[PDB]
């Protein structure tokens, strides 16, 4: 599980937007520095930048 | 297909210069964080930094 350290506005449809403090379940981190995640606030899934987060 | 989020001026002849909003076809992304691309505005080919773009 990870928590967002900053707000992020999606730059593409498959990105996730999120607020600081939001928590995520990581679904797929093997493709690079953008990870597929599930928002635990909205249930929405999408890619997030892995330098915007820290482990919980 | 990718779109440019910022302007970039080539630092070398094999780089592509581009403007924000320009669109690209990626020809080779296997060499690192600089990808060979084709500008869909000019047809010009060259390397672009893959943090200056987002999927369309």
């Amino acid at each position: 599980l990870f928590v967002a350290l900053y707000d992020y506005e999606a730059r593409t449809e498959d990105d996730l937007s999120f607020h600081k403090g939001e928590k995520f379940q990581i679904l797929n981190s093997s493709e690079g520095d953008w990870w597929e995640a599930r928002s635990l606030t909205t249930g929405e899934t999408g890619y997030i930048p892995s330098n915007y987060v820290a482990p919980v | 297909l990718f779109v440019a989020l910022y302007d970039y001026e080539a630092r070398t002849e094999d780089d592509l210069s581009f403007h924000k909003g320009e669109k690209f076809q990626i020809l080779n992304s296997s060499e690192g964080d600089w990808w060979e691309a084709r500008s869909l505005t000019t047809g010009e080919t060259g390397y672009i930094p893959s943090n200056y773009v987002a999927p369309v």
Binding site: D7, Y8, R11, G32, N51 | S29
Partner: peptide
């Protein structure tokens, strides 16, 4: 807000 990382290949 930090700079974004390079996109996945």
């Amino acid at each position: 807000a930090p700079p974004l990382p390079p996109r996945n290949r």
